[PDB]
Design an enzyme around this catalytic site. Sequence first.
Site, short mmCIF file in Angstrom:
data_model
loop_
_atom_site.label_atom_id
_atom_site.label_comp_id
_atom_site.label_asym_id
_atom_site.label_seq_id
_atom_site.Cartn_x
_atom_site.Cartn_y
_atom_site.Cartn_z
N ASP A 10 0.79 -1.23 0.00
CA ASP A 10 0.00 0.00 0.00
C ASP A 10 0.82 1.28 0.00
O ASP A 10 0.45 2.26 0.64
CB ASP A 10 -0.99 0.00 1.16
CG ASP A 10 -2.32 0.63 0.80
OD1 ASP A 10 -3.29 0.41 1.57
OD2 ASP A 10 -2.42 1.33 -0.25
N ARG A 42 -0.57 9.15 0.10
CA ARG A 42 -1.58 9.30 1.15
C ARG A 42 -1.07 8.66 2.45
O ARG A 42 -1.42 9.10 3.56
CB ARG A 42 -2.94 8.70 0.72
CG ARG A 42 -2.95 7.18 0.54
CD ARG A 42 -4.35 6.62 0.29
NE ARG A 42 -4.30 5.19 -0.03
CZ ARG A 42 -4.05 4.68 -1.24
NH1 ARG A 42 -3.84 5.47 -2.29
NH2 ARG A 42 -4.02 3.36 -1.41
N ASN A 43 -0.20 7.66 2.29
CA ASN A 43 0.32 6.84 3.39
C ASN A 43 1.67 7.29 3.93
O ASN A 43 2.20 6.68 4.87
CB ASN A 43 0.39 5.39 2.95
CG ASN A 43 -0.96 4.83 2.62
OD1 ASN A 43 -1.97 5.22 3.20
ND2 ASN A 43 -0.99 3.90 1.67
N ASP A 49 1.31 4.32 9.90
CA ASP A 49 0.83 3.02 10.32
C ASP A 49 0.27 2.20 9.13
O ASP A 49 -0.61 2.66 8.40
CB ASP A 49 -0.22 3.18 11.41
CG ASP A 49 -0.86 1.87 11.79
OD1 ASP A 49 -0.18 1.03 12.41
OD2 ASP A 49 -2.05 1.68 11.47
C1 LIG Z 1 -0.99 16.35 13.29
O1 LIG Z 1 -0.74 14.93 13.18
C2 LIG Z 1 -1.39 14.46 12.09
C3 LIG Z 1 -2.49 15.14 11.57
C4 LIG Z 1 -3.15 14.66 10.44
C5 LIG Z 1 -2.70 13.48 9.84
C6 LIG Z 1 -1.60 12.81 10.36
C7 LIG Z 1 -0.95 13.28 11.50
N1 LIG Z 1 0.11 12.65 12.02
C8 LIG Z 1 0.16 11.34 12.24
N2 LIG Z 1 1.20 10.85 12.92
C9 LIG Z 1 1.29 9.54 13.15
C10 LIG Z 1 0.31 8.66 12.70
CL1 LIG Z 1 0.45 6.96 13.03
C11 LIG Z 1 -0.78 9.18 11.99
N3 LIG Z 1 -1.76 8.39 11.51
C12 LIG Z 1 -2.47 8.74 10.42
C13 LIG Z 1 -3.39 9.77 10.53
C14 LIG Z 1 -4.14 10.17 9.44
C15 LIG Z 1 -4.00 9.55 8.20
N4 LIG Z 1 -4.80 10.02 7.12
C16 LIG Z 1 -4.94 9.28 5.83
C17 LIG Z 1 -5.44 10.27 4.76
C18 LIG Z 1 -6.85 10.79 5.14
N5 LIG Z 1 -7.41 11.79 4.18
C19 LIG Z 1 -6.40 12.57 3.40
C20 LIG Z 1 -7.16 13.49 2.36
C21 LIG Z 1 -8.67 13.58 2.69
C22 LIG Z 1 -9.33 12.18 2.69
C23 LIG Z 1 -8.33 11.11 3.23
C24 LIG Z 1 -6.89 11.33 6.60
C25 LIG Z 1 -5.51 11.34 7.29
C26 LIG Z 1 -3.07 8.51 8.09
C27 LIG Z 1 -2.32 8.09 9.18
C28 LIG Z 1 -1.50 7.04 8.74
O2 LIG Z 1 -0.70 6.43 9.44
N6 LIG Z 1 -1.69 6.76 7.45
C29 LIG Z 1 -0.97 5.72 6.72
C30 LIG Z 1 -2.70 7.64 6.88
N7 LIG Z 1 -0.81 10.52 11.79
#
Ligand SMILES: COc1ccccc1Nc1ncc(Cl)c(Nc2ccc(N3CCC(N4CCCCC4)CC3)c3c2C(=O)N(C)C3)n1
Length: 258
Positions: free
Chosen positions: A133, A137-138, A151
Amino acid sequence: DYEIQRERIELGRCIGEGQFGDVHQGIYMSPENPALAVAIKTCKNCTSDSVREKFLQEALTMRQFDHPHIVKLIGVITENPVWIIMELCTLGELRSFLQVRKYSLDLASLILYAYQLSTALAYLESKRFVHRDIAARNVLVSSNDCVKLGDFGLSLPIKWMAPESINFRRFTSASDVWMFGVCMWEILMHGVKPFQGVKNNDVIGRIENGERLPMPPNCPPTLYSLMTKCWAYDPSRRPRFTELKAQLSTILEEEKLQ
Ligand SMILES: COc1ccccc1Nc1ncc(Cl)c(Nc2ccc(N3CCC(N4CCCCC4)CC3)c3c2C(=O)N(C)C3)n1
């Protein structure tokens, strides 16, 4: 000892959504010791025991890996509601970041991201773990000079998939390389998605016709050559992730010079 006291956790605003529940940002507190920024994976239906074991298997997966450019598992809270606590990437998803900072990111920073990820993917290759994957986006952004794969739990993507994965559900590291190829394209394109307006069915016929994603404006010739090698129809002609790492290293140095 990955078991964490709930009282050490402060839940904050919601940052996304998973198959099991909402993802939150928050703080992990500790005597001494400031305060650690964390991602908190939650679980709507962790009431049942089948769902709980599916949800926690995701924690187990991340625990297997220890790499600077892959998100770290911090711990788990195994009473209801069950929580997985990951490290936070404060700056968010790679796609939003590239779209917003379109005019303050030199070509050198985009190549850095592609290289950093490739180091992570070489690590997963050497462990013989097939991601399946790989897509922008990831990818997440820790800081300006640091991206990380998010993740795996939170990550069919027809427009990103290798032919043999589409046609024969064969997912291997060489299929990951193709996906990585698509991802390097997304990065260079500042977060634009492959095959806009193209229905998922049209995709494969075009890939067999020979059509590949275009060279992004300003993309250095040698880097697009590398992308096209990631999209060799026959997956044995595609370069391994360790090969990509050594090429993106020289490519980047070349650009840090301009
Ligand atoms: C401020 O910290 C934030 C804020 C917004 C998103 C991510 C973020 N930081 C993270 N830090 C660690 C982790 Cl494990 C994490 N987890 C996620 C948190 C959010 C996501 N998203 C996936 C994309 C999603 N979105 C993106 C565009 C609009 C529709 C789909 C919503 C956000 C993801 C995460 C992830 O691991 N993957 C593979 C995708 N986010």
